């Protein structure tokens, strides 16, 4: 009863740990995207006290609600800052591979963009209980449209919110589908729904809520904090799981203010179970660090090897892009046009906020098409359609310096954008550990154009020509300035695979590190259930988790990996045979 024993151990010491004499039946690696969606359901029932740990700030920024500012978002304090390892298979480089640092996670870096993919994605599964007949149900728990509300394929009560883009007011965007329309036997699709072929022009349905971006922070995590029963850590960047013959987690080792560590540790009650959200580029870092991985990559840097999983950090499957750009003929208008000089708009942000939002509700890319490069069983190609002209072969880096466009701006040349992703690629990268700090980034090589037939390639290559043939389309031919970005000085498959490969990058949804596999599975990470095969009170639940990458982006599957398992956690549904 002093006044520095008052100070100097009671609102000093008790204020650091928030974790200290607790306790916890569900703690939570991240709070990214799956993170809080289990956040929301594992809480909803008043017993079950859980805890999640995000590195980032929570999502305050008016940069992730209004979706347009994705380009403010790119290289900033709001990103993990992520460059891959040297590929030598793509001349140099060092790719830089975007992922949300944040509240809500990557589902607040977003392109928004809401695609399930083809029910064929979901059966070529090692489907145990995973099956394309078993998932659908829990897509369609959470939707809410507005496109349709019976639906088989598709609902509407739950959290998410998916929409038609609330911008459109262009003739750019006819012109695409009148010019593929043309160029060769593409007809309309309405995707996701599986009754459709999923090949096919047309619109993608956007994760915004009447043009403000609708993450999984906003719809999942922010109406429900505030229970007494959910702890939200913000700023805590995760460790290492603390594990144990019988290998049991007990808890996570975790550290606000970083490097200048203090080791807290959070404790798990008598039930479960700690379960790991933090993506598939640090889920399988972190589980490295915990002791869960290929031995002697484990060795390499003396940590204890619990399990042993060869899977862990193997079967990264990332997507990879290219680019088609052009000006039009004097016909200055539109996107970069409308809402851009050289400096920011102006209508623009009274049609945003207020107006029922219009363009700047963004993002670009919103259209386009799943195409069949060369009669695959399911579309190789996605095509997504800007109505604004990129300015790098990179579409990422094109974004980034669309933000660095303001009071130095003459005037953005004012074109259209085809990005050509190969959809189900062929080649697969790998995630590792670059040194035995867990502080240290985790070591990304992507392996981009590294299958063994050249097929994730040639996807791509085809995919240039499709391009071109929509540009000389009788519709898009007169509005174009023709020429090109990649050049018309790019003609030969060789001149356009060293473009390509130049100028290859991210369409951003990278899955499959630590997957999903049944019975025997020599290369799996976790069982039937997302368990994680060595340990008891450990799971991933997450979109390291994907066996094979599906069709489309990949938000709204791991919103639905998380749905299905929230509901496992809690009774409430069952995954194979008992
Ligand atoms: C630029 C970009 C655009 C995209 N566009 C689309 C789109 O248009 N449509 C679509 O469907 N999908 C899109 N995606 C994909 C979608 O956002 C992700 O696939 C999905 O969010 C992955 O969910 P997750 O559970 O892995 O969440 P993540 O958000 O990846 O969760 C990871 C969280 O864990 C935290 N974390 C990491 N390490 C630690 C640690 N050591 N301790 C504590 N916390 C940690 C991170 O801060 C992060 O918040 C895009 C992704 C990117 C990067
Ligand atoms: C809204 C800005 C429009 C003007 C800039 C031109 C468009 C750039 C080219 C399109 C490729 C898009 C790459 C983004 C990748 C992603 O979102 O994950």
Redesign the pocket.
Known sequence: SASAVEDIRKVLSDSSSPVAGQKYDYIL???????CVLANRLSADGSKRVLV????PDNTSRDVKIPAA?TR??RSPLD?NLFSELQEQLAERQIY???????????????????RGAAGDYDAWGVEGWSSEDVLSWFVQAETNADFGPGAYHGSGGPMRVENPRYTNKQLHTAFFKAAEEVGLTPNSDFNDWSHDHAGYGT?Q??QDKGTRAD?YRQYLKPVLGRRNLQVLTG????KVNIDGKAQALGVE?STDGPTGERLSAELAPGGEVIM???????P??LKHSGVGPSAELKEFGIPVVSNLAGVGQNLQDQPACLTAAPVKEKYDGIAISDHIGQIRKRAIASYLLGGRGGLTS?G?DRGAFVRTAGQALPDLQVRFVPGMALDPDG?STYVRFAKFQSQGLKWPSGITMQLIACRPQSTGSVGLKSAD?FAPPKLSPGYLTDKDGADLATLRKGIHWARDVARSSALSEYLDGELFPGSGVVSDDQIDEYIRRSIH??????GTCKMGNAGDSSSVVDNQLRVHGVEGLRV????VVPKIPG????????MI?ERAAALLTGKATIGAS
């Open positions: 690696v991240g709070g990214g995207t799956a993170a740990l995000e590195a980032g994705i978002l790119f993990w591979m975007a992922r949300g640092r944040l509240l809500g996670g990557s589902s607040a870096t977003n392109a928004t963009l809401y695609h993608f956007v994760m999984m805590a960047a995760v460790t975790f959200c933090a993506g598939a580029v640090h889920t870092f972190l993002t890319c990422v867990p991210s369409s951003n949804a990278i899955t639940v997450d979109a390291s489309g982006q990949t938000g709204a599957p791991v919103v998380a």
